[PDB]
Design a protein around this ligand. Structure first.
Ligand SMILES: [Cu+2]
Ligand SMILES: [Cu+2]
Ligand SMILES: [Cu+2]
Ligand SMILES: [Cu+2]
Ligand SMILES: [Cu+2]
Ligand SMILES: [Cu+2]
Lengths: 172, 172, 172, 172, 172, 172
């Protein structure tokens, strides 16, 4: 056992590793989206920039989780980062909807993690999740919902002008 | 009687209290609108910002009226701030039209107040209304009329693109 | 259902709306106090300034709650802001005592809200309450208790000199 | 009962007093260590500086707990600060190990305190512990574990050169 | 024997350790006073600040004595820091009187220490006491006497207004 | 076919995708190493920092390759990022040796890619590889070889002091 480990259940350690893999997967999904919008036949540079920023933020989340795993005396166990479900989205609106679904899945995983930490009476882990992940997830979900709403109201995906103007005015 | 009271009719004091309540009600209507446009399914951030600014300005108007009530030796008598007539507006254009109607109602109340002060031969009250409220109301009504005209000409409310572009270019 | 709503119980949404109304009511009570101390026959300018600042802070609390309601996909439902129980306090000490009672009532409501969020397993809501409201309430209650203690020890309310000196030295 | 006391159980008040005494004891243990390494026959100035800083931080923790006791309307009850178990450590590595054990004991006490506050449904106390003490304890334990690991790997305590170089490069 | 020890009698070493414990005890008495005046039902913030500063100064005195013990090749032997005789003082004047009595006791101990060092022909120890402690004690006693005199003349402890004004004007 | 595609063979596109996956895999290996050295029982902070920087650089290399894929009209096809072969290295020297082997493998892949581009008469691809990857690989391999040589000469892995001093002086 680690000399620093205290009140750190093995179930919590395993769930933290699963969350690390989930954050890495989300980052790599966002990377796929970003370079989809960099394509010559899509060419929405601000969508690409937005999703690249999201990918970097997800990477940061993963790194923070690994740092906590080491802080608590757990052992990081990495797994394959699976390829994203889609190589194509055919519209900025569809990518935003997929991002919203992904963020909600990540949020559900974080909520299950918080429930596990509460059951294991690990207040440090609960506070870590609450302070660094829960409100960030809520803000991200709200922002993506706003983007989806605006794109739908503007006439996307059937209107390329809508996506162009959204790229220029909201994401630019 | 207050040691500072001079040429301050009780009718004027009561009308000032009614105007205080009206300004508070207008502020709270604007607050309702502002957070309607903050909703995920509406997501017009500049409409929300505009109406929040209007709410703060209305609060300021109310506070100025209370300060005058104290200056003249009147006694502030507060009443319930009634909830706004609408929880929903379904478009920025409808909210702008409602704001225009509200500002015209506030203006009519101020004009009746000025007529009362003129009848009571209260030149200080008349000058206070003229200097701090009448031209502000005229400017607000003109600005709201301009917004309504532009939104209607752009194709609102049937065109979500119109409201999006108006949010970006006029209110942003 | 809102596209962003996740782990947000309807009971929590209703309690948040009730808390919004409570914060608005507290702000309007503080406003009443502030302009009571602006009266010519009371004339305690720093008491008025203190209570006006408290009113603005309460308004901010209400706005933050509305923002959370929108963030979580809840729907803001506003109600009448009831007039304050008192139009008169006859002393700074009595106003401070009333403010202490009001802040304790707001705190009790927030604690019940936190208990509801804990029962509904809404860690984001629990953390929001803890981070933005609970310690602010504790600090406000402590400060008001200190003010009440100092005013009582100085000889208020029977000593106008006590309230004058407290206005100058503590609130100024 | 205190005019500010609300949702503050007597058991929580007693546990807070016990934690105050524990933090003071930890500070005084660290002080003992610091001046052990200031001895002419030990002469590890950066170890002394490190433990003096730790002592000051522990004092700060105690003061924060006393401030909370007053904020919540509890009554501070001080007890004797017992002398540290050891007047001698014969090596920097042994002092680091003792500090690690002490910090883990303090952490266990804080976790028991958080469990008590959770049982008493005192969310303000729970959030105070989580925000100001739990992650600080985790970071301190991790840092001490790192120091112990590095000292052991460098050849301490049998190698005075190891402790000298660690004093110069890690603690300096 | 220490390689640096020279003209350092064991009696002087023991007396220095006793003085270390006395300074720590005085610091902890001052800490108790400081947080007594932070209570909601006392609420004299400048009294609390004054006594907290005194506590920090006493801690500094203790640390200086420990540093001298190490400089001369003596060995620091710590003892329990006993809890202060009083948990309550019921007035700023009573706390000032207690502080005056405490400082006079510390001064008497320092004078006995100087007499011992003179008897042992330890000019370095005599000069250390004279330079760093004797005039500081005289100044502290004079300042506390001034505070006690002013509080008594102002009508303390029977006049809460006196203590409030003294807190604002002398300690603020 | 892409409107921008010109002199871009499908074999080159596939090899670029394979290289993207290889760079991502190398980044994730470096990430694993970095957080291995962040462990409490390893505690070599500058090794961790060095490998984290290497991971970020590898990510940058991958992103540059994806950007080229889009520039030339190829289509990015992502694959699973496989977990690193090792979760443990038991020494900084072993991690450096593994990094050297990994960089040589990446270099061999880049050389095969350059040979393919030369065979396909794709001078733009050849120049891209030469300008952005070949000399970077040579420099990285040389630096890792230097680190391995220095660690071996200092007595690693059997000497923890060697790895500590290397962490402080070369990587710090
Ligand atoms: Cu994330
Ligand atoms: Cu107005
Ligand atoms: Cu509030
Ligand atoms: Cu501590
Ligand atoms: Cu002293
Ligand atoms: Cu590379």
């Amino acid at each position: 056992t680690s000399q620093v480990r205290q009140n750190y259940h093995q179930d919590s350690e395993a769930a933290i590793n699963r969350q690390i893999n989930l954050e890495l997967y989300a980052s790599y999904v966002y990377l796929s989206m970003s370079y989809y919008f960099d394509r010559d036949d899509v060419a929405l540079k601000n969508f690409a920039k937005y999703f690249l920023h999201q990918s970097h933020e997800e990477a940061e989340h993963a790194a923070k989780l690994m740092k906590l795993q080491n802080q608590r005396g757990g052992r990081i166990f990495l797994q394959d980062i699976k390829k994203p479900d889609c190589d194509d989205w055919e519209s900025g609106l569809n990518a935003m909807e997929c991002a919203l679904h992904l963020e909600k899945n990540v949020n559900q995983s974080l909520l299950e993690l918080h429930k596990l930490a509460t059951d294991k009476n690990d207040p440090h882990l609960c506070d870590f999740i609450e302070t660094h992940y829960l409100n960030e997830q809520v803000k991200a979900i709200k922002e993506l919902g706003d983007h989806v709403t605006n794109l739908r109201k503007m006439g996307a995906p059937e209107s390329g002008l809508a996506e162009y103007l959204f790229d220029k005015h909201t994401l630019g």
